[PDB]
Design a protein around this ligand. Structure first.
Ligand SMILES: Cc1ccncc1N(C)C(=O)Cc1cccc(Cl)c1
Ligand SMILES: Cc1ccncc1N(C)C(=O)Cc1cccc(Cl)c1
Lengths: 304, 304
């Protein structure tokens, strides 16, 4: 019973958090094996961020300019390289707490947990989704850069996000663990506006199945629809177009509840057209799009 | 920038989770020092839960009937006692991962993180609040009993909740770590209905300050009110009566934003009377009451 915006347990990622200082800039680093991953803008001053030339700025940095602190003990930096927008600091000690891990680049719509950190120390964990415009609606202040986003499959942590930037509109931009930015963003203190933040339709449907599973059924109607008819309505309300691939992924939820995917789409169509009329679904007065069909299955089954 | 329903990092609590089996019932235990804490209903079968006499049922249980497993290794049970609705299993080994801890009984309105567990393994972490009717709106399935609720102050984990029961309405009931139930609930498979779930007013106001801090200001109006006038409106909308103690606790938020507590109460009064007119505040279409004034301060300042 109950449906909560649930993050993965963060212990495996807490044991990887370090503080990285270069000159007078301090941010977070991720220590996996003998490598510390951090945003390359750690080498920048506020003057540098206007139009930084990172290859040029890196020339004036040596291994001894990067101060890596784990807890309260100093790690010895024996190498450094730049891969896209992240710095990789080779340290002389493998992290004893390194869990089983992969680096994965997620697609928009996919959700993940963020362990927000300041000065190598964790402050909290929350669930996010990679928006269709490649931003994330996180909760980050100055000092949080280098905090990571991740998913866990039993004992393997798939790191998918590293926090880099706050856009002028309060939304956030970052890279995968190879330093490649999600979306068109660049690590520069330049006005970069986000694209349309459309609703993740497959996620709304998944959350409507989670609601049916937990008792909220008022929104189930007597209608059905087709993918093309649903998509006309989805376009009007800035919802992502629903594909047969999304229908396939909703299959286990459709099988458990006995409600066909297209029938649930007609319910979602009526919810868009009429609104919720002062009602709630799973304690929310709007249609939640940050639970994937996998998240609903996991939460509703008890996957540990 | 951004405001998220954030849980505390769960690593310190993950290192305390064990699996407790008694006969054919398996649930979660909390291993702190040389003691394992778990719900006393671990000794019950489904037949026993109808009208259990726990003192009588405990007579037929010996130390060797409690199987405590940490990871995949077995802990030796050298003692057992019942304290209210929890069992305390004395083990022969202190938990090497025991963090600094306290046991605290929280008041309704107070928030905490829950590490949901199944078979001693963590599945996820989310933020909760102790409702004014002493229930929590968690996300728990069969097997989750013994999962705990907690707050962290730097290095000290204050354990405040142990999950015991699911009421017939899908809401949850549990004890503090002394085995004392929050509210009037009893660990028996008997219909127990919850009281009125009123809104935590001090928390809504705190979240309105968090919204002003992050840019959502449309709801700020030209009005002010008094505590007695606000409370007449609060009574009508099933909101907890606001006291001067709540006003005092909102003081730091009032000081940061420069918006008097009573002025923010008049904004909340108009939001109750008129609704949100299809608008949102911090991405929500309803007034959020599961952030305390302390949570807003911590999240908005970056306390690690
Ligand atoms: C202030 C803040 C709040 C939340 N998250 C991040 C920040 N910071 C530190 C930045 O955006 C810095 C920055 C500026 C310009 C480009 C880049 Cl790559 C980084
Ligand atoms: C099914 C479920 C779902 C979510 N959380 C808990 C449960 N369980 C296991 C119970 O409520 C058992 C129980 C029944 C009656 C009294 C008590 Cl003290 C415990």
């Amino acid at each position: 019973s109950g449906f909560r915006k649930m993050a993965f347990p963060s212990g495996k990622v807490e044991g990887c958090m370090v503080q990285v200082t270069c000159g007078t800039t301090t941010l977070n680093g991720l220590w996996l094996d003998d490598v510390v991953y951090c945003p390359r803008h750690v080498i920048c001053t506020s003057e540098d961020m206007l139009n930084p030339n990172y290859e040029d700025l890196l020339i004036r940095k040596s291994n001894h300019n990067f101060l890596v602190q784990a807890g309260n003990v100093q790690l010895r930096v024996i190498g450094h390289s730049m891969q896209n927008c992240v710095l990789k600091l080779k340290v002389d000690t493998a992290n004893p707490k390194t869990p089983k891990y992969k680096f994965v680049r997620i697609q928009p719509g996919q959700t993940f947990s963020v362990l927000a950190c300041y000065n190598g120390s964790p402050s909290g964990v929350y669930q996010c989704a990679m928006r269709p415009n490649f931003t994330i609606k996180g909760s980050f202040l100055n000092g949080s850069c280098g905090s990571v986003g991740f998913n866990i499959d039993y004992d393997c942590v798939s790191f998918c996000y590293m926090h880099h930037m706050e856009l002028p509109t309060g939304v956030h931009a970052g890279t995968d663990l190879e330093g490649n930015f999600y979306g068109p963003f660049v690590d520069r203190q330049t006005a970069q506006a986000a694209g349309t933040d459309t609703t993740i339709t497959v996620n709304v449907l998944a959350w409507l199945y989670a609601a049916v599973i937990n008792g909220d059924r008022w929104f189930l109607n007597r209608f059905t629809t087709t993918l093309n008819d649903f998509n006309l309505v989805a376009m009007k309300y800035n919802y992502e177009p629903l594909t047969q691939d999304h229908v396939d992924i909703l299959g286990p939820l459709s099988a458990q509840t006995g409600i066909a995917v297209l029938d649930m789409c007609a319910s979602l169509k009526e919810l868009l057209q009429n609104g919720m009329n002062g009602r709630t679904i799973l304690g929310s007065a709007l249609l939640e799009d940050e639970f994937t069909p996998f998240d609903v299955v996991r939460q509703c089954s008890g996957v540990t």
